[PDB]
Amino acid sequence: MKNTCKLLVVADHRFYRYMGRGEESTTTNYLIELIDRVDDIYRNTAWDNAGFKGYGIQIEQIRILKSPQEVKPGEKHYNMAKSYPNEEKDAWDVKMLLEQFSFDIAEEASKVCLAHLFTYQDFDMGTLGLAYVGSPRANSHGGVCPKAYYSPVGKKNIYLNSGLTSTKNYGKTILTKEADLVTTHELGHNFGAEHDPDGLAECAPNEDQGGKYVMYPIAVSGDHENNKMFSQCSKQSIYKTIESKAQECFQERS
Ligand SMILES: [Zn+2]
């Protein structure tokens, strides 16, 4: 039916050079494969533990920004060669970066269920990504489905159906299996999931119980059985969002 959230996938010049080897083919295939692996997790998840399954993601359009964005003095762009505010770090403040991407990609984002940015930046405090949390409410801007949000400062309409993933952490490239989980997790927020309560052991098992689920606030290793699965807490939240938003912007799988 309408069980697929089409994506606008964007790779900046950093991801192109460091993850893609300066090759459009390589960068492109990497993203295509990663999204498909993430899609397997979503598609096989039974949100109602019964029959509400088969919902996933699929790339609608891929954009590879081979080189940085020629910028002028006092202006900033998410694909600009240098980082903001501290260029020396070559890693933006993740929050400002997600907002900038949303501002600059507004036009295209209005045409897709979700827009996701892939970069290669070593964000402070082991941060690997960020994304706006979705909601079942139609007038709630964040997450799945485009809903114009007038940005007082931006002086224009933007869409908060976005998120980003970085495959660099502590000076090195993270593992492929870790990359898959960062994106699953960020898309998870987009799909309506909040962080698993570090209290309710039902949603945050001990290592001898299979480990944490993908939406735990501290990045899982991906070594354990539960690491690439959504908890009950996440299933309930995402089910709620999907139930109403799927009718809103989900399409059929191509
Ligand atoms: Zn999170």
PDB file of C-alpha atoms and ligand atoms in Angstrom:
ATOM      1  CA  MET A   1       0.000   0.000   0.000  1.00  0.00           C
ATOM      2  CA  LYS A   2       1.639   3.203   1.308  1.00  0.00           C
ATOM      3  CA  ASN A   3       4.248   1.649   3.589  1.00  0.00           C
ATOM      4  CA  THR A   4       7.447   3.290   2.430  1.00  0.00           C
ATOM      5  CA  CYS A   5       9.144   6.511   3.553  1.00  0.00           C
ATOM      6  CA  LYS A   6      11.054   7.785   0.487  1.00  0.00           C
ATOM      7  CA  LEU A   7      14.345   9.494   1.236  1.00  0.00           C
ATOM      8  CA  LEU A   8      16.484  12.308  -0.068  1.00  0.00           C
ATOM      9  CA  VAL A   9      20.025  11.164   0.743  1.00  0.00           C
ATOM     10  CA  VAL A  10      22.846  13.718   0.679  1.00  0.00           C
ATOM     11  CA  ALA A  11      26.572  13.095   1.025  1.00  0.00           C
ATOM     12  CA  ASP A  12      28.783  16.130   1.578  1.00  0.00           C
ATOM     13  CA  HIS A  13      32.327  16.599   0.253  1.00  0.00           C
ATOM     14  CA  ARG A  14      33.855  15.100   3.415  1.00  0.00           C
ATOM     15  CA  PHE A  15      31.907  11.879   3.096  1.00  0.00           C
ATOM     16  CA  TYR A  16      32.747  11.864  -0.611  1.00  0.00           C
ATOM     17  CA  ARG A  17      36.481  12.189  -0.086  1.00  0.00           C
ATOM     18  CA  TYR A  18      36.999  10.064   3.014  1.00  0.00           C
ATOM     19  CA  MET A  19      34.325   7.377   2.768  1.00  0.00           C
ATOM     20  CA  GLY A  20      33.840   7.319  -0.998  1.00  0.00           C
ATOM     21  CA  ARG A  21      37.481   7.695  -2.037  1.00  0.00           C
ATOM     22  CA  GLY A  22      36.656  10.683  -4.212  1.00  0.00           C
ATOM     23  CA  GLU A  23      34.603   8.360  -6.404  1.00  0.00           C
ATOM     24  CA  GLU A  24      30.926   9.042  -7.101  1.00  0.00           C
ATOM     25  CA  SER A  25      30.377   5.364  -7.835  1.00  0.00           C
ATOM     26  CA  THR A  26      31.930   4.239  -4.541  1.00  0.00           C
ATOM     27  CA  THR A  27      30.190   6.881  -2.402  1.00  0.00           C
ATOM     28  CA  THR A  28      26.856   6.146  -4.097  1.00  0.00           C
ATOM     29  CA  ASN A  29      27.060   2.358  -3.718  1.00  0.00           C
ATOM     30  CA  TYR A  30      28.042   2.690  -0.072  1.00  0.00           C
ATOM     31  CA  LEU A  31      24.984   4.791   0.763  1.00  0.00           C
ATOM     32  CA  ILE A  32      22.674   2.607  -1.316  1.00  0.00           C
ATOM     33  CA  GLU A  33      23.909  -0.463   0.514  1.00  0.00           C
ATOM     34  CA  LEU A  34      23.744   1.148   3.970  1.00  0.00           C
ATOM     35  CA  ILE A  35      20.139   2.337   3.491  1.00  0.00           C
ATOM     36  CA  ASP A  36      19.133  -1.125   2.255  1.00  0.00           C
ATOM     37  CA  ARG A  37      20.650  -2.747   5.356  1.00  0.00           C
ATOM     38  CA  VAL A  38      18.897  -0.219   7.576  1.00  0.00           C
ATOM     39  CA  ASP A  39      15.722  -0.918   5.585  1.00  0.00           C
ATOM     40  CA  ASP A  40      16.000  -4.629   6.467  1.00  0.00           C
ATOM     41  CA  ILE A  41      15.804  -3.752  10.162  1.00  0.00           C
ATOM     42  CA  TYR A  42      12.759  -1.513   9.640  1.00  0.00           C
ATOM     43  CA  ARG A  43      10.926  -3.786   7.191  1.00  0.00           C
ATOM     44  CA  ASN A  44      11.276  -6.831   9.413  1.00  0.00           C
ATOM     45  CA  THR A  45      10.185  -5.041  12.582  1.00  0.00           C
ATOM     46  CA  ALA A  46       6.621  -5.838  13.705  1.00  0.00           C
ATOM     47  CA  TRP A  47       5.611  -2.504  15.222  1.00  0.00           C
ATOM     48  CA  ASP A  48       2.555  -4.083  16.833  1.00  0.00           C
ATOM     49  CA  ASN A  49       4.373  -7.371  17.408  1.00  0.00           C
ATOM     50  CA  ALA A  50       1.728  -8.828  15.101  1.00  0.00           C
ATOM     51  CA  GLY A  51       0.983  -7.903  11.503  1.00  0.00           C
ATOM     52  CA  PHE A  52       1.810  -4.210  11.281  1.00  0.00           C
ATOM     53  CA  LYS A  53       5.094  -4.820   9.459  1.00  0.00           C
ATOM     54  CA  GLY A  54       6.726  -4.225   6.099  1.00  0.00           C
ATOM     55  CA  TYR A  55       7.203  -0.499   6.679  1.00  0.00           C
ATOM     56  CA  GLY A  56      10.596   0.786   5.690  1.00  0.00           C
ATOM     57  CA  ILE A  57      12.663   3.263   3.746  1.00  0.00           C
ATOM     58  CA  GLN A  58      13.873   3.639   0.196  1.00  0.00           C
ATOM     59  CA  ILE A  59      16.054   6.236  -1.476  1.00  0.00           C
ATOM     60  CA  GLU A  60      14.092   8.548  -3.752  1.00  0.00           C
ATOM     61  CA  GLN A  61      17.084  10.686  -4.714  1.00  0.00           C
ATOM     62  CA  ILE A  62      20.827  10.635  -4.024  1.00  0.00           C
ATOM     63  CA  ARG A  63      22.950  13.783  -4.173  1.00  0.00           C
ATOM     64  CA  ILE A  64      26.746  13.571  -3.998  1.00  0.00           C
ATOM     65  CA  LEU A  65      28.455  16.910  -3.328  1.00  0.00           C
ATOM     66  CA  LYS A  66      31.928  16.141  -4.734  1.00  0.00           C
ATOM     67  CA  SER A  67      33.554  19.380  -3.591  1.00  0.00           C
ATOM     68  CA  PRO A  68      32.881  21.942  -0.854  1.00  0.00           C
ATOM     69  CA  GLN A  69      30.476  24.828  -1.362  1.00  0.00           C
ATOM     70  CA  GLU A  70      32.107  28.072  -2.482  1.00  0.00           C
ATOM     71  CA  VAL A  71      30.908  30.478   0.212  1.00  0.00           C
ATOM     72  CA  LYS A  72      31.462  34.208   0.802  1.00  0.00           C
ATOM     73  CA  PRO A  73      32.534  36.024   4.026  1.00  0.00           C
ATOM     74  CA  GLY A  74      29.761  36.250   6.629  1.00  0.00           C
ATOM     75  CA  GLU A  75      27.591  33.475   5.120  1.00  0.00           C
ATOM     76  CA  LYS A  76      27.484  29.748   5.961  1.00  0.00           C
ATOM     77  CA  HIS A  77      26.455  26.567   4.096  1.00  0.00           C
ATOM     78  CA  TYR A  78      26.228  22.968   5.365  1.00  0.00           C
ATOM     79  CA  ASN A  79      28.598  21.810   2.623  1.00  0.00           C
ATOM     80  CA  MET A  80      31.141  24.597   3.156  1.00  0.00           C
ATOM     81  CA  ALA A  81      34.804  23.557   3.278  1.00  0.00           C
ATOM     82  CA  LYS A  82      35.233  24.792   6.835  1.00  0.00           C
ATOM     83  CA  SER A  83      33.458  23.986  10.089  1.00  0.00           C
ATOM     84  CA  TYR A  84      31.322  26.344  12.122  1.00  0.00           C
ATOM     85  CA  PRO A  85      32.071  27.795  14.574  1.00  0.00           C
ATOM     86  CA  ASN A  86      35.534  26.238  15.060  1.00  0.00           C
ATOM     87  CA  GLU A  87      36.968  25.417  11.648  1.00  0.00           C
ATOM     88  CA  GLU A  88      40.135  24.135  13.318  1.00  0.00           C
ATOM     89  CA  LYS A  89      38.059  21.145  14.491  1.00  0.00           C
ATOM     90  CA  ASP A  90      36.687  20.363  11.012  1.00  0.00           C
ATOM     91  CA  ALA A  91      33.545  19.322  12.876  1.00  0.00           C
ATOM     92  CA  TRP A  92      30.520  21.594  13.313  1.00  0.00           C
ATOM     93  CA  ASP A  93      28.389  21.914  16.391  1.00  0.00           C
ATOM     94  CA  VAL A  94      26.087  19.017  15.419  1.00  0.00           C
ATOM     95  CA  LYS A  95      22.913  20.940  16.314  1.00  0.00           C
ATOM     96  CA  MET A  96      23.818  23.995  14.257  1.00  0.00           C
ATOM     97  CA  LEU A  97      24.829  21.695  11.435  1.00  0.00           C
ATOM     98  CA  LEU A  98      21.478  19.898  11.363  1.00  0.00           C
ATOM     99  CA  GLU A  99      19.676  23.231  11.349  1.00  0.00           C
ATOM    100  CA  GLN A 100      21.883  24.562   8.529  1.00  0.00           C
ATOM    101  CA  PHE A 101      21.250  21.454   6.423  1.00  0.00           C
ATOM    102  CA  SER A 102      17.510  21.849   7.011  1.00  0.00           C
ATOM    103  CA  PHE A 103      17.701  25.491   5.914  1.00  0.00           C
ATOM    104  CA  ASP A 104      19.764  24.847   2.774  1.00  0.00           C
ATOM    105  CA  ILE A 105      17.838  21.725   1.722  1.00  0.00           C
ATOM    106  CA  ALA A 106      14.311  23.048   2.381  1.00  0.00           C
ATOM    107  CA  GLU A 107      13.136  23.050  -1.233  1.00  0.00           C
ATOM    108  CA  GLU A 108      14.043  19.405  -1.834  1.00  0.00           C
ATOM    109  CA  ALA A 109      13.000  18.252   1.651  1.00  0.00           C
ATOM    110  CA  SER A 110       9.456  19.461   1.003  1.00  0.00           C
ATOM    111  CA  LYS A 111       9.257  16.756  -1.662  1.00  0.00           C
ATOM    112  CA  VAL A 112      10.246  13.751   0.433  1.00  0.00           C
ATOM    113  CA  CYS A 113       9.218  11.889   3.581  1.00  0.00           C
ATOM    114  CA  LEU A 114      12.733  12.392   5.035  1.00  0.00           C
ATOM    115  CA  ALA A 115      16.066  14.028   4.122  1.00  0.00           C
ATOM    116  CA  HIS A 116      19.301  12.628   5.534  1.00  0.00           C
ATOM    117  CA  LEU A 117      22.823  14.031   5.441  1.00  0.00           C
ATOM    118  CA  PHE A 118      25.895  11.788   5.551  1.00  0.00           C
ATOM    119  CA  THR A 119      29.165  13.405   6.550  1.00  0.00           C
ATOM    120  CA  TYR A 120      32.614  12.596   7.955  1.00  0.00           C
ATOM    121  CA  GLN A 121      33.108  14.880  10.956  1.00  0.00           C
ATOM    122  CA  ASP A 122      34.471  14.048  14.401  1.00  0.00           C
ATOM    123  CA  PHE A 123      31.812  15.738  16.558  1.00  0.00           C
ATOM    124  CA  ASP A 124      32.586  16.464  20.220  1.00  0.00           C
ATOM    125  CA  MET A 125      31.772  13.937  22.945  1.00  0.00           C
ATOM    126  CA  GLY A 126      31.516  10.888  20.694  1.00  0.00           C
ATOM    127  CA  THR A 127      28.416  12.295  18.966  1.00  0.00           C
ATOM    128  CA  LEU A 128      27.661  10.428  15.732  1.00  0.00           C
ATOM    129  CA  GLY A 129      24.392  11.958  14.604  1.00  0.00           C
ATOM    130  CA  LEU A 130      21.246  13.958  15.244  1.00  0.00           C
ATOM    131  CA  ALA A 131      17.646  14.080  14.032  1.00  0.00           C
ATOM    132  CA  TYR A 132      14.313  15.727  14.868  1.00  0.00           C
ATOM    133  CA  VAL A 133      11.836  13.424  16.614  1.00  0.00           C
ATOM    134  CA  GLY A 134       8.673  12.616  14.703  1.00  0.00           C
ATOM    135  CA  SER A 135       5.135  12.542  16.047  1.00  0.00           C
ATOM    136  CA  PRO A 136       1.654  11.267  15.175  1.00  0.00           C
ATOM    137  CA  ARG A 137       0.348  14.850  15.257  1.00  0.00           C
ATOM    138  CA  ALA A 138      -0.036  16.429  11.802  1.00  0.00           C
ATOM    139  CA  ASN A 139       0.990  19.920  12.918  1.00  0.00           C
ATOM    140  CA  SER A 140       4.153  18.701  14.682  1.00  0.00           C
ATOM    141  CA  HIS A 141       7.034  19.599  12.335  1.00  0.00           C
ATOM    142  CA  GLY A 142       9.795  17.208  13.353  1.00  0.00           C
ATOM    143  CA  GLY A 143      10.408  13.792  11.869  1.00  0.00           C
ATOM    144  CA  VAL A 144       8.614  11.970   9.078  1.00  0.00           C
ATOM    145  CA  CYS A 145       6.651  14.039   6.566  1.00  0.00           C
ATOM    146  CA  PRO A 146       7.340  17.605   5.391  1.00  0.00           C
ATOM    147  CA  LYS A 147       5.478  20.369   7.237  1.00  0.00           C
ATOM    148  CA  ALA A 148       6.672  23.912   6.605  1.00  0.00           C
ATOM    149  CA  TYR A 149       8.096  25.514   9.722  1.00  0.00           C
ATOM    150  CA  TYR A 150       8.721  29.225   9.380  1.00  0.00           C
ATOM    151  CA  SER A 151      12.178  29.923  10.779  1.00  0.00           C
ATOM    152  CA  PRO A 152      12.090  33.367  12.466  1.00  0.00           C
ATOM    153  CA  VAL A 153      15.860  33.727  12.088  1.00  0.00           C
ATOM    154  CA  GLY A 154      16.116  31.918   8.759  1.00  0.00           C
ATOM    155  CA  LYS A 155      13.488  34.263   7.343  1.00  0.00           C
ATOM    156  CA  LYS A 156      11.945  31.366   5.425  1.00  0.00           C
ATOM    157  CA  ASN A 157      10.076  28.077   5.508  1.00  0.00           C
ATOM    158  CA  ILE A 158      12.112  25.008   6.341  1.00  0.00           C
ATOM    159  CA  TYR A 159      11.318  21.387   7.062  1.00  0.00           C
ATOM    160  CA  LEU A 160      12.315  19.455  10.147  1.00  0.00           C
ATOM    161  CA  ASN A 161      11.902  16.011   8.541  1.00  0.00           C
ATOM    162  CA  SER A 162      15.668  15.667   8.671  1.00  0.00           C
ATOM    163  CA  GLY A 163      18.644  14.019  10.300  1.00  0.00           C
ATOM    164  CA  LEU A 164      22.342  13.376   9.770  1.00  0.00           C
ATOM    165  CA  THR A 165      24.956  10.665  10.248  1.00  0.00           C
ATOM    166  CA  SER A 166      28.739  10.962  10.553  1.00  0.00           C
ATOM    167  CA  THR A 167      31.038   7.972  10.090  1.00  0.00           C
ATOM    168  CA  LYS A 168      34.045   9.545  11.842  1.00  0.00           C
ATOM    169  CA  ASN A 169      34.612   9.312  15.602  1.00  0.00           C
ATOM    170  CA  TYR A 170      37.760   9.772  17.689  1.00  0.00           C
ATOM    171  CA  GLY A 171      40.003  10.337  14.695  1.00  0.00           C
ATOM    172  CA  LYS A 172      38.927   7.242  12.802  1.00  0.00           C
ATOM    173  CA  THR A 173      36.293   5.721  10.555  1.00  0.00           C
ATOM    174  CA  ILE A 174      33.669   3.834  12.558  1.00  0.00           C
ATOM    175  CA  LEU A 175      32.735   0.262  11.745  1.00  0.00           C
ATOM    176  CA  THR A 176      30.283  -0.525   8.953  1.00  0.00           C
ATOM    177  CA  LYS A 177      28.053  -2.258  11.490  1.00  0.00           C
ATOM    178  CA  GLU A 178      28.214   0.847  13.688  1.00  0.00           C
ATOM    179  CA  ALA A 179      27.367   3.138  10.776  1.00  0.00           C
ATOM    180  CA  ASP A 180      24.205   1.130  10.063  1.00  0.00           C
ATOM    181  CA  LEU A 181      23.096   1.615  13.677  1.00  0.00           C
ATOM    182  CA  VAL A 182      23.741   5.357  13.795  1.00  0.00           C
ATOM    183  CA  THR A 183      21.421   5.830  10.807  1.00  0.00           C
ATOM    184  CA  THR A 184      18.866   3.312  12.102  1.00  0.00           C
ATOM    185  CA  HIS A 185      18.888   5.252  15.377  1.00  0.00           C
ATOM    186  CA  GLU A 186      18.596   8.724  13.796  1.00  0.00           C
ATOM    187  CA  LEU A 187      15.873   7.575  11.402  1.00  0.00           C
ATOM    188  CA  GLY A 188      14.407   6.065  14.571  1.00  0.00           C
ATOM    189  CA  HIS A 189      14.017   9.509  16.094  1.00  0.00           C
ATOM    190  CA  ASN A 190      12.524  10.692  12.784  1.00  0.00           C
ATOM    191  CA  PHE A 191      10.032   7.802  12.948  1.00  0.00           C
ATOM    192  CA  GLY A 192       8.893   8.980  16.383  1.00  0.00           C
ATOM    193  CA  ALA A 193      11.114   7.062  18.803  1.00  0.00           C
ATOM    194  CA  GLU A 194      12.516   8.745  21.907  1.00  0.00           C
ATOM    195  CA  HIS A 195      15.433   7.292  23.856  1.00  0.00           C
ATOM    196  CA  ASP A 196      14.907   3.991  25.657  1.00  0.00           C
ATOM    197  CA  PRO A 197      14.298   4.649  29.381  1.00  0.00           C
ATOM    198  CA  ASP A 198      17.564   3.755  31.087  1.00  0.00           C
ATOM    199  CA  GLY A 199      15.338   2.625  33.931  1.00  0.00           C
ATOM    200  CA  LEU A 200      12.736   0.236  32.569  1.00  0.00           C
ATOM    201  CA  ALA A 201      14.867  -2.894  32.159  1.00  0.00           C
ATOM    202  CA  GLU A 202      12.259  -4.057  29.661  1.00  0.00           C
ATOM    203  CA  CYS A 203      13.652  -1.517  27.180  1.00  0.00           C
ATOM    204  CA  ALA A 204      17.273  -1.454  28.374  1.00  0.00           C
ATOM    205  CA  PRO A 205      18.418  -5.071  29.050  1.00  0.00           C
ATOM    206  CA  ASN A 206      21.735  -6.030  30.637  1.00  0.00           C
ATOM    207  CA  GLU A 207      24.433  -7.545  28.412  1.00  0.00           C
ATOM    208  CA  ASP A 208      23.532 -11.037  29.660  1.00  0.00           C
ATOM    209  CA  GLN A 209      19.970 -10.398  28.447  1.00  0.00           C
ATOM    210  CA  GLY A 210      21.015  -9.517  24.911  1.00  0.00           C
ATOM    211  CA  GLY A 211      22.210  -5.974  25.526  1.00  0.00           C
ATOM    212  CA  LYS A 212      20.619  -2.616  24.816  1.00  0.00           C
ATOM    213  CA  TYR A 213      18.257  -1.870  21.940  1.00  0.00           C
ATOM    214  CA  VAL A 214      19.143   0.490  19.102  1.00  0.00           C
ATOM    215  CA  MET A 215      17.457   3.525  20.696  1.00  0.00           C
ATOM    216  CA  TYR A 216      19.565   3.508  23.884  1.00  0.00           C
ATOM    217  CA  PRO A 217      21.048   7.008  24.469  1.00  0.00           C
ATOM    218  CA  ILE A 218      24.612   5.682  24.630  1.00  0.00           C
ATOM    219  CA  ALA A 219      25.753   4.298  21.258  1.00  0.00           C
ATOM    220  CA  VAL A 220      25.585   0.495  21.248  1.00  0.00           C
ATOM    221  CA  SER A 221      28.515  -1.566  19.949  1.00  0.00           C
ATOM    222  CA  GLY A 222      26.388  -3.576  17.569  1.00  0.00           C
ATOM    223  CA  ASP A 223      28.006  -6.687  19.092  1.00  0.00           C
ATOM    224  CA  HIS A 224      24.849  -7.827  20.893  1.00  0.00           C
ATOM    225  CA  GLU A 225      21.615  -9.408  19.683  1.00  0.00           C
ATOM    226  CA  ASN A 226      19.346  -6.529  20.747  1.00  0.00           C
ATOM    227  CA  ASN A 227      21.635  -3.756  19.408  1.00  0.00           C
ATOM    228  CA  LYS A 228      20.051  -3.753  15.946  1.00  0.00           C
ATOM    229  CA  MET A 229      16.469  -4.102  17.122  1.00  0.00           C
ATOM    230  CA  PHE A 230      13.874  -1.659  18.406  1.00  0.00           C
ATOM    231  CA  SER A 231      12.633  -2.053  21.988  1.00  0.00           C
ATOM    232  CA  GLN A 232       8.957  -2.219  22.978  1.00  0.00           C
ATOM    233  CA  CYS A 233       9.200   1.405  24.078  1.00  0.00           C
ATOM    234  CA  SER A 234      10.354   2.349  20.571  1.00  0.00           C
ATOM    235  CA  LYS A 235       7.825   0.104  18.855  1.00  0.00           C
ATOM    236  CA  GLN A 236       4.945   1.751  20.695  1.00  0.00           C
ATOM    237  CA  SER A 237       6.139   5.290  19.913  1.00  0.00           C
ATOM    238  CA  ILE A 238       6.937   4.569  16.281  1.00  0.00           C
ATOM    239  CA  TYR A 239       3.734   2.576  15.789  1.00  0.00           C
ATOM    240  CA  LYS A 240       1.795   5.627  16.962  1.00  0.00           C
ATOM    241  CA  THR A 241       3.624   7.915  14.546  1.00  0.00           C
ATOM    242  CA  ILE A 242       3.449   5.535  11.582  1.00  0.00           C
ATOM    243  CA  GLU A 243      -0.255   4.876  12.109  1.00  0.00           C
ATOM    244  CA  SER A 244      -1.171   8.468  11.258  1.00  0.00           C
ATOM    245  CA  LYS A 245       1.843   9.770   9.342  1.00  0.00           C
ATOM    246  CA  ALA A 246       2.111   6.839   6.909  1.00  0.00           C
ATOM    247  CA  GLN A 247      -1.228   7.911   5.436  1.00  0.00           C
ATOM    248  CA  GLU A 248       0.267  11.396   5.419  1.00  0.00           C
ATOM    249  CA  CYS A 249       3.454  10.895   3.389  1.00  0.00           C
ATOM    250  CA  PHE A 250       4.355   7.211   2.991  1.00  0.00           C
ATOM    251  CA  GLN A 251       4.285   5.732  -0.508  1.00  0.00           C
ATOM    252  CA  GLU A 252       4.559   2.350  -2.172  1.00  0.00           C
ATOM    253  CA  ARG A 253       7.820   0.418  -2.315  1.00  0.00           C
ATOM    254  CA  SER A 254       9.533   0.545  -5.733  1.00  0.00           C
TER     255      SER A 254
HETATM  256 ZN    ZN B   1      19.267   9.443  20.001  1.00  0.00          ZN
END
